[PDB]
Structure 1
Amino acid sequence: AFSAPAAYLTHQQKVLRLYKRALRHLESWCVHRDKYRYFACLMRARFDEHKNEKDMVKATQLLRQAEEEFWYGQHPQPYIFPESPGGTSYERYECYKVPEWCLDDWHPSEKAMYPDYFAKREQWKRLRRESWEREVKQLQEETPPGGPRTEALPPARKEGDLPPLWWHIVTRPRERPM
């Protein structure tokens, strides 16, 4: 989620993703650790047996057949980590995530209840407001005339600068906000 996607997935990426999916579904089928280790070793033996293949057409055909085999033999109810998409704990804490722009609508009494925090918050706000022009200038200098070709952002070249478009990434709510 933190990395900009590419235009397409290469053959190596396709086969690696298929290998990971097959291992995860095999672990779902093979509940016990020793049995899972045995069959995962067999699966990697198959992958290594097909590893060396100069013919890309034959490699693609093998990949297609392997994908068909995986879809036929997949676990109907595969194991999913609780926080992963589709998991039992996915998006559970999204209702507790409140942003700093909500935080600056507080009453003066509430703000006075937390004196030291808001001084640092004001420092952060000044730091944000003193860098936006440099960030936009750096972004517009490094773009091609046609426009961006990828969703990757440049870092900060100078010592006193900050990586452009950093505010929300840095100040995103914690994974357990409450």
Structure 2
Amino acid sequence: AFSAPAAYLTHQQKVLRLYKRALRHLESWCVHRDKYRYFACLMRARFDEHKNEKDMVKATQLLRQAEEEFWYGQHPQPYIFPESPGGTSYERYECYKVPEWCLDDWHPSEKAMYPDYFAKREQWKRLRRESWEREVKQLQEETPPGGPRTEALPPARKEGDLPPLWWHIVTRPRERPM
């Protein structure tokens, strides 16, 4: 969610992700904590059995048949954390998230209430306006001629610089905005 993805997953990343998925589905099957703990240790052991394999081909085939086993034996209804992409509360509070630019269309009578908040907002807007050009120039400096290669962004490097393209990351609404 926060990190730039890479062009591909390594064998090691695939193996770790399969480890996590197998553990979570096993916990879904093994409801109770002790029984899950037992079978999770058995899983870790069966996983460690092929830990130090040097033949890449046989390691790949082990991973492949392990994925086939996981698919045949997965839980049809695994546990999902409530705010996770399948959870019962996944996007529950998206109707409460209002972008900050809406505050500029407020009537002056609405901004009469909350004077301090809006003064501090004018300060933030000044900051963004005075940082933008340095951000653009820095991004043009640090980027190869054939366009960027990944979605990674550089930090600030000078005295009063801000990390380029920061406004919509810093001014997110909230995750419980009301």
Provide TM-score, normalisation by structure 2: 0.99
- Kindly provide the CA deviation profile for residues 22-44 of structure 1, in whole angstroms up to 9, marking residues without a partner as x: 00000000000000000000000
Tell me, what secondary structure is at the counterpart of 1:131? helix
Query: Cα RMSD between the aligned structures?
Result: 0.4
Residue 119 of structure 1 aligns to a residue in which SS?
Answer: helix
**How many corresponding residue pairs?**
178
Structure 1: how far apart are the matches of 2:46 and 2:148?
41
How far is the alpha carbon of 1:100 from its aligned partner? 1.0
Could you tell me which residue of structure 2 aligns to residue 104 of structure 1?
Answer: 104
For the pair 1:148 / 2:129, whether they are aligned, the reply is no
By how many angstroms is 1:78 displaced?
0.3
CA–CA distance in 1 between the matches of 2:62 and 2:29? 23
Gaps of 5+ in 2: none
Once the 2 structures are TM-superposed, how far is the Cα of residue 159 of structure 1 from its aligned partner?
A: 1.7
1:83-102 CA-to-partner distances (Å, cap 9, x unmatched) read 00010000000000001111
CA shift, 1:71, in A, is: 0.1
CA distance in 2 between partners of 1:2 and 1:119 (Å)? 31
Please list the CA deviations of residues 32-63 of structure 1 after superposition, one character each: whole Å capped at 9, or x if unmatched.
00000000000000111111100000000000
The match for 1:41 is 41
| TM-score between the two structures when normalised by the length of structure 1 | 0.99
Write out per-residue CA displacement over residues 112-154 of structure 1, whole angstroms, 9 at most, x where no aligned residue.
Answer: 1111100000000000000100000000011101010000000
Name the stretch that deviates more: 118-127 or 95-104. 95-104
1:104 Cα deviation (Å)? 1.1
Identical amino acids, percent of aligned pairs? 100
Distance 2:95 2:142 in 1: 38
How far residue 160 of structure 1 moved from its aligned partner, in angstroms, is 0.5
Cα deviation for residue 5 of structure 1 reads 0.3
**TM-superposed deviation, 1:16:** 0.1
Counterparts of 1:109 and 1:22 in 2: how far apart (Å)?
Answer: 58
